[PDB]
C-alpha cells in the first residue's frame, strides 16, 4: 500500500530547461531543491538563487527578483561576492539526483535560473519540495 504523499509533501517545478518559474514558500516552514540531468554534460553549469516579495498592485503576485545573500556557516569559507550559488559538477551521471537547500528564508517567494542560457543549460531539471504546512 502506498499513500497520497503529495498531500503532505508537494513539489513544484522551478526550472524546466527553458523557463524559470517563481515558487511560493509562504505556507511551508521547510523546503529544498532537487536536481537531475537528462543527457551527458559538456561542462559545469552554475545557477543563481533569487527571492521575491509581494508586489505593489496585488498581494498575491511576486515582485522583481532579489538576489539571495550568503550566510557563512559555523566556520568555513565565504563566497567571493557574498551571494549564494549552486554549481552542478560535470561528472554527474544521468541516473542520479542531487539535493541541497539554502539556510535562510528571506522573501516569501523563491526562484532559480542558470547564469547563462545555452545548449548545456537545457540538460538540467530543478524541482522544489515543501514540508510542514502551517495553515
Amino acid at each position: 500500500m502506498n499513500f497520497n504523499v503529495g498531500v503532505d509533501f508537494p513539489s513544484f517545478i522551478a526550472w524546466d530547461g527553458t523557463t524559470s518559474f517563481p515558487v511560493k514558500i509562504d505556507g511551508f516552514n521547510q523546503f529544498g531543491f532537487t536536481f537531475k540531468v537528462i543527457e551527458e554534460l559538456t561542462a559545469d553549469v552554475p545557477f543563481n538563487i533569487f527571492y521575491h516579495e509581494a508586489s505593489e498592485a496585488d498581494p498575491c503576485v511576486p515582485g522583481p527578483a532579489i538576489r539571495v545573500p550568503d550566510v557563512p556557516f559555523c566556520d568555513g569559507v565565504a563566497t567571493a561576492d557574498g551571494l549564494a550559488t549552486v554549481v552542478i559538477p560535470e561528472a554527474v551521471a544521468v541516473d542520479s539526483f542531487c539535493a541541497g537547500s539554502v539556510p535562510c528564508f528571506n522573501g516569501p517567494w523563491i526562484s532559480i535560473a542558470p547564469v547563462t542560457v545555452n545548449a548545456d543549460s537545457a540538460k538540467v531539471q530543478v524541482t522544489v519540495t515543501m514540508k510542514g504546512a502551517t495553515r
Binding site: F35, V77, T79, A84, T85, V86, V87, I88, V92, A93, D95, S96, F97, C98, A99, G100, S101, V102
Partner: peptide, 27 residues
Amino acid sequence: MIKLNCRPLCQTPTASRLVSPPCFICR
C-alpha cells in the same frame, strides 16, 4: 556555495571473469 548530496538511482551489474593458471610449460 551550497554543497549537494548525491547518490545514484540504478544498479549496474558486474560480470568479472575468473582466471586460473593455464598449466605448466618448460619455460
